[PDB]
Amino acid sequence: ANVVVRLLIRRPECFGPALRGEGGNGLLAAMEEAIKIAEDPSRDGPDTIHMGNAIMTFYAALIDLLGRCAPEMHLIHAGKGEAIRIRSILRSLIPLGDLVGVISIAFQMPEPDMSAGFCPDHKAAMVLFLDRVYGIEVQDFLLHLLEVGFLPDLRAAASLDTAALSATDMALALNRYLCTAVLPLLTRCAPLFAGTEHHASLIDSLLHTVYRLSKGCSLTKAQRDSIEVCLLSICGQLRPSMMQHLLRRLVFDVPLLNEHAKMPLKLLTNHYERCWKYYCLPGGWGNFGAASEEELHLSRKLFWGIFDALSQKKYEQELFKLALPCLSAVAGALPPDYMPEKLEYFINKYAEHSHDKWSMDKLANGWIYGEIYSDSSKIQPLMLLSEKEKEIYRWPIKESLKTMLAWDLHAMAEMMAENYHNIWAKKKKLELESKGGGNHPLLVPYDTLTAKEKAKDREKAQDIFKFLQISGYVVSRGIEKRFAYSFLQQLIRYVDEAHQYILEFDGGSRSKGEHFPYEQEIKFFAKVVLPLIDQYFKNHRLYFLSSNKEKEMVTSLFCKLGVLVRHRISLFGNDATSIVNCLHILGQTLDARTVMKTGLDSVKSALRAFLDNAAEDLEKTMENLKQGQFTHTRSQPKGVTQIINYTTVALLPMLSSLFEHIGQHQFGEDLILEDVQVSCYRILTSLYALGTSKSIYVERQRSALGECLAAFAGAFPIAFLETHLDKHNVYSIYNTRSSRERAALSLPANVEDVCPNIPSLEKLMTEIIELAESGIRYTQMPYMMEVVLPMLCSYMSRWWEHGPENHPERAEMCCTALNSEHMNTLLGNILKIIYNNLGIDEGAWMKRLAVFSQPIINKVKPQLLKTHFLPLMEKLKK
Amino acid sequence: PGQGRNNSNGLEIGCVVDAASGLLTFIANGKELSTYYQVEPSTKLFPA
Secondary structure (H helix, E strand, C coil), rough: CHHHHHHHHHHHHHHHCCCCCCCCCCCHHHHHHHHHHHHHHCCCCCCCCCCHHHEEEEEHHHHHHHHHCCCCCHHHHHHCHHHHHHHHHHHHCCCHHHHHHHHHCCCCCCCCCCCCCHHHHHHHHHHHHHHHCCCCCCHCCCCCHHHHHHHHHHHHHHHHCCCHHHCCCCHHHHHHHHHHHHHHHHHHHHHHHHCCCCCCCHHHHHHHHHHHHCCCCCHHHHHHHHHHHHHHHHHHHCCHHHHHHHHHHHHHHHHCCHHHHHHHHHHHHHHHHHHHHHCCCCCCCCCHHCCCCCHHHHHHHHHHHHHHHHHHHHCHHHHHHHHHHHHHHHHHHHCCCCCHHHHHHHHHHHHHHHHHHHHHHHHHHHEEEECCCCCCEECCCCCCHHHHHHHHHHHHHHHHHHHHHHHCCCHHHHHHHHHHHHHHHHHHHHHHHHHCCCCHHHHHHCCCHHHHHHHHHHHHHHHHHHHHHCCCCCCCCCCHHHHHHHHHHHHHHHHHHHHHHHHHHCEEEEEEECCCCHHHHHHHHHHHHHHHHHHHHHCCCCCCCCCHHHHHHHHHHHHHHHHHHHHHHHCCCCCCCHHHHHHHHHHCCHHHHHHHCCHHHHHHHHHHHHHHHHHHHHHHHHHHHHHHCCCCCCCCHHHHHHHHCCCCCCCCHHHHHHHHHHCCCCCHHHCCHHHHHHHHHHHHEEEHHHHHHCCHHHHHHHHHHHHHHHHHHCCCCCCCCCCCCHHHHHCCCHCCCHHHHHHHHCCCCCCCHHHCCCCCCHHHHHHHCCCCCCCHCCCCHHHHCCCCCCHHHHCCCCCCCCCCCCCCCCCCCCCCCCCCCHHHHHHHHHHHHHHHCCCCCHHHHHHHHHHHHHCCCCCCCHHHHHHHHHHHHHHHCC | HHHHHHHHCCEEEEEEECCCCCCCEEECCCCEEEEEECCCCCCCCCCC
């Protein structure tokens, strides 16, 4: 490149005569003269060679050579001063304005036309030179280039889109040059034109023209990919408010779910995920603004359109996996709480007021009364427009009134302006067809066109609507619980339908080689709707503590899903984890206080029944594991295996999440009472016995067993291990319920008999002291070092919050005897055990013990430091 | 009346201050306004 540049600068005779300084004609004038050569047969004088085409190709080749011999890349140019000299020489060689002119020289849309004239390869050469040599950085420069020549080529592409017009080789070649010109924007200056809006007209014109291009026919796969990347970049870093028209177009086009729908699906996905606050938060995306009511309505319409369209659509792995992020993004963006004679008199009054306005304007300009309406002498008979002009301009007013009567005020004015623009475009298209001429770019609608042309009609529409509201005529087109209730109601109908499909599929015998349509619907649900609900409860207020009936529907859906998982977990072979995660988030978002108050009584009783079913499954698992039937047991019945798998996998962590949420939000005192208390004691006994059992599968699933038991202990507001102290507690089931009522509820007259298997609280004291003395370890006695030491830790945390030291006034009322001294004793036992563990390489459980004791580290006396904290950390230092 | 739409040169309001008598008078496009003010001795008035 260096030597080529040296030779060219030493001998400018290699260049075109126009480029040489001897003539100084200029590159743009050279191409204009080449066009003239092409037009003039004598200029293109006597397989044949077009003389102007030869000149033009020569100049394009020279420009391409200079652009390619320019400095390679920006850092090379910056570091190499010689590269700076070369770039300066090329800049002085070729003016920038000449490049803009040549890139603006447009083509002739063909009825074939012969390839003679300016060509897309010529434009590609000039744009390559402009991009490489001069650089394309300044924002106003980008906008000026976009408006000059760049957008016109896109308009030509929009024209050429049609089948025969694409059959034109001009369309084909222009597609190539169009890729070579569209890749620039994004790669070089995606951020800038998307960071400014100085020509918002140009912005919208670019967006919808590129979109119409993307709705092409003969475009190659790579071409379509390039267009899609361009659109995604521009949208994903352009202002949300300034492509709302494009939002509209995608809103109509996405529900088609055609092959072309993939690109808009990505577009909306990125748009909503990007500016999520803009469509949800009250202030939106900060200075970017917030989604107007119209934008929210369009987003909701698109949301339900895609929802129903995917519901009706046959399940496709690729298409639905691509569409799921879009629907999730729109759900996240949508706020959870989002919701004649008079006209003739108006015409007369507007005519009078307009006559007054014309008189005032003409006298302000300096008009005089006269028969002629010519503006050369400033004479008017309507004191520019004459009486005939006024009476003919009366007609469009009546036409607009009739149109919008057959169909707020500003929106209707915009609609009327679009209607008048469309009718004018139709009239001019008819005139062009009659005259046998080419179609002007103005034929495309207002949205496809720039915003500047809209303003001309918008001013008239605003004026006529101001006159209408002055006259006194208003014309148009003609709960926050409901938002969630609608989309959650789609979910509940989905779940009821899925229940029906599973019941029918189980009732009917399976056919080998024939897949059930019900099973297909189940798969579609579990692969589309099932992931969607968790994304719903994420980033949405559905428990309305930040819609009580919304909370009720959430609880009822939880009950239905829990029943479905309990009965037919085996059917969800691959979506079991997804549905269990949805159960977790349902418990996290569940308001048990609302389950108790302002919650449908049948729904809350169904929740009690589901918890009782969980207790029954836990009891069955108890019996199976005691008998020796588990996963490791080969001789295990199918139903028993299903019960054990369901319990250990799903039921433990799910109930763990529910009880953790209940304990965190103090929901135990409201949801858990009476029969719920009895069933919770049953669950407690089941979990205790399952943990006590020393089966290998129990050991494998020990973490979830303990996690659930601790969650239950925390959530519960009443005493169930204070065997000889439950009488003091006011909340006690023995204090509230009578002996006969407890007997009916299947509870004896002694709390010791209620919980005989579990050691009493004092016996637990003695056992923990024995742990501290004997130095137990998870190797010898794992059951209560890493499984139940957390249990007694959480137990004592709860009862330490409710104990006498925290409530000296209620010390007698506090059934528990756990104080700060017991708190220190338990923490010291934990650290004594940790010290016994210090010096082994199997203590993966110590970190777990740290987690268990983390809630109870900051509520101890300072006396424990010298006793235990120092020895452990000294040995750690060792 | 009518000068808001008929006057191409705009509105000119001329203020005259007679300091010997402390009198403020106003004229609108050559027409004397009925509104006038009387100020106290030793008062400093700022055009505003």
